[PDB]
Amino acid sequence: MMYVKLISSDGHEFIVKREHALTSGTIKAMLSNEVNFREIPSHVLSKVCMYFTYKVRYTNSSTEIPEFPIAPEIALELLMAANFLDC
Amino acid sequence: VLRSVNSREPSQVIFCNRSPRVVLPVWLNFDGEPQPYPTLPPGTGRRIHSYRGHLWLFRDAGTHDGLLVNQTELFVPSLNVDGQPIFANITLPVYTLKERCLQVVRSLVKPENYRRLDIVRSLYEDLEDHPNVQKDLERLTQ
Amino acid sequence: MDVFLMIRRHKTTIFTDAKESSTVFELKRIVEGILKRPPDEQRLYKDDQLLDDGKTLGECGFTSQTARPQAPATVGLAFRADDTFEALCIEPFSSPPELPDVMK
Ligand SMILES: Cc1ncsc1-c1ccc(CNC(=O)[C@@H]2C[C@@H](O)CN2C(=O)[C@@H](NC(=O)C2(C#N)CC2)C(C)(C)C)cc1
C-alpha cells in the first residue's frame, strides 16, 4: 500500500494512505511523498486524518452514519484548516 | 417548478429517523411553498398518510442543517404494493469537514458575535450564510 | 470486522486498519512495510501492556465498536537499537488555546 507523510507545525509526523490524503485538492497539488504544514498544529492535523478515515469509510454506505465529533476548543482552528485544504 | 402533484391517490409511509438530530419534515405544497410538519426525536418513527406524487424533504429542526432520505435529497411516496407502507430512512449525510466545523462554531457563537471572530472575511460570510430551505429550493430547481 | 488504529512512537503516528481476527505479529509486518524495521526489532503495546505475537487484536481488546474510524484506538510502538529496546515513549499532541470570549 502507498502511504504519504503529513507533518504538523510542531513536528508530529502523520502517516496515512495516499488515497485518503487525496481527499484534499490542496494536498494533491502539494504532492503533484512528504508535506509540511507550517500553520497547522498536531492537535488539529490529527483530527484532519481522522476525518479522512471517516469519509472514506462512510461515503456510499447504508449502515447508519454517526456524527463526526469536534470538541469546542479545536473548532475554530479546524475550520481554518478545512478552508485551506478545501475538504 | 418544484411542487407536489394533486393526485389524490393515498400512500402510507413510515418516517424513520436514524439520525441523532431532531427532525423536521417539510412538504412542498401545490404552489411549491414549504409547509413544516411535526418533529421527530432522534431514533423515533411515525406512520403517516401522504399521497403519490407528493414531495418531501428533511432538516434538523433547530439549525435547519440538511438531511438525506433514502440516500437522496427528496422523497416521493410511491404505490403501496401488498398493503405494505413505503420506508423513508432519514440519515445524516457525510458533511464536508468545513460544513461540520461551521455547524459547531454556529452552535457556540451568537450571530451578533461572528464578526468578532479572528478569521478571514469570507468565513464570516460562510457563517452568516446558514442553511435555509428556500436557498436549497432554488438550487434544486436548477 | 475492521478496527481502526493509530500506531504511535515518539513523534510518529500511523493511521491504518486491520481485522479483529488478525494477529499482533501481522500488525508488525504492516509497520515493517511502512517504517522498514523487522518484527524482531518491534514491541507493540496497549497502554503499558506488552502484546504477544500470536494473539488477535480482538483478544487484546481492539474491537470494531471501540476502534472507530472517527475515533481510532492507540497502539504503542518501541524499537530495538543495537542489543536492547528503548522504553515506550509517545510524544503528546499540542494543547488547544483557551476558548475565545465569544465562544464561552
Ligand atoms: C404525525 C406526524 N409526525 C411527523 S409528520 C406527521 C404527520 C401528521 C399529519 C399528516 C396528515 N397528512 C397530510 O397532511 C398529508 C401530507 C401531505 O401529503 C399533504 N397531506 C394532505 O392530507 C393534503 N391532502 C391532500 O392532498 C388531499 C386530500 N385530502 C387531496 C388528497 C392536505 C390536506 C395537506 C392538502 C401527515 C404526517
Numbering used by the authors:
A (entry chain B): 16 to 47, 58 to 112
B (entry chain C): 62 to 203
C (entry chain A): 1 to 104
The authors write:
HIF-α, among which HIF-1α and HIF-2α are predominant, are maintained at very low levels under normoxia as a result of highly efficient polyubiquitination by the von Hippel–Lindau (VHL) Cullin RING E3 ubiquitin ligase complex (CRL2VHL) and subsequent proteasomal degradation. Key to the highly specific molecular recognition of HIF-α by VHL is the post-translational hydroxylation of key HIF-α proline residues by the oxygen-dependent activity of prolyl hydroxylase domain (PHD) enzymes.
We therefore designed VH298, based on our crystal structure of inhibitor VH032 bound to VHL30. VH298 bears a cyanocyclopropyl group in place of the terminal methyl group of VH032. VH298 showed a Kd of 90 nM as determined by isothermal titration calorimetry (ITC) and 80 nM in a competitive fluorescence polarization assay, affording the most potent VHL:HIF-α inhibitor reported to date. The cyanocyclopropyl group fits snugly at the far left-hand side pocket of the HIF-1α binding site on VHL, with the cyclopropyl moiety projecting towards the aliphatic side chain of Arg69, and the cyano group pointing away from the surface and towards solvent in an anti conformation relative to the amide carbonyl. This corresponds to a highly favored, minimum energy conformation for amides substituted with electron withdrawing groups at the alpha carbon next to the carbonyl, as well documented for alpha-fluoroamides. This bent conformation of Arg69 has been previously observed when a Leu or tert-Leu group of the inhibitor is occupying the far left-hand side pocket, as well as with a bound HIF-1α peptide which bears a Leu residue at this position, suggesting flexibility of Arg69 could be exploited to accommodate a range of different functional groups at this left-hand side. Altogether, the biophysical, structural and cell-based in vitro data obtained are consistent with a selective high-affinity engagement of VH298 with VHL as its main target.
